[PDB]
Assembly symmetry: C3
Homo-oligomer: 89 residues x 3
């Protein structure tokens, strides 16, 4: 029926990130005040959720990507996407 999205934003501009699960893969579109561009995030998933927080001006993002019942956390902490410690049980 349809793609599934998750969105987060931060700061005053703001920056926005929209994650889209489509056909088994999640990709990312980004707005930093001037226009939309494709982000670095690209991971398997049929479902996605996201949360983010600032430490000063530094953004931290957590993306929860699920296939089946297997949910992987992906972390942005300023220097690339890394696999997080999240486990579902």
């Amino acid at each position: 029926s349809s793609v599934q999205t998750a969105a987060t934003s931060w700061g005053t501009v703001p920056s926005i990130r929209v994650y889209t699960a489509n056909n088994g893969r999640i990709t990312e579109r980004c707005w930093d005040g001037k226009g939309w561009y494709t982000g670095a995030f690209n991971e398997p998933g049929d479902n996605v959720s996201v949360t983010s927080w600032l430490v000063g001006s530094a953004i931290h993002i957590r993306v929860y990507a699920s296939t089946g019942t297997t949910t992987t956390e992906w972390c942005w902490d300023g220097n690339g996407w890394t696999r997080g410690a999240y486990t579902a049980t």
Copy 2:
């Protein structure tokens, strides 16, 4: 099969907005501290996500409404819902 929701909130009261995709249409329920009422947002979609931010006391909301793989951004900036610049590619 079940309806799909997205939620955002802001301020200290807080205000809450809950968007529900049901049978191809997304509608909005709103809480501003006293009770729930039906909001102005009404757009096609099978899937919904949302983010929001304050500029001072002014709320800005972005709702991402998807059908198929077609995602439309809807913007609240204080003066009605407008179509945003978001594109998926």
Copy 3:
């Protein structure tokens, strides 16, 4: 197909809560800076969304749990999960 999740976070640590709808039930995993543990939230639902806000250091969470077209709001205000006033229509 897959499980469906919703996530929220607050504060500087931060605390994170991830809600997962799986096979008709929503459960909660929690991070408070040291590790992940299973939270108190456990309610029926095929779909979940969440929002939260701080009042000072006190967290308030609202989880919207849906089955069919019936959405129930669950509230955390420091003293257990309670059913909220949310209704989907008049």
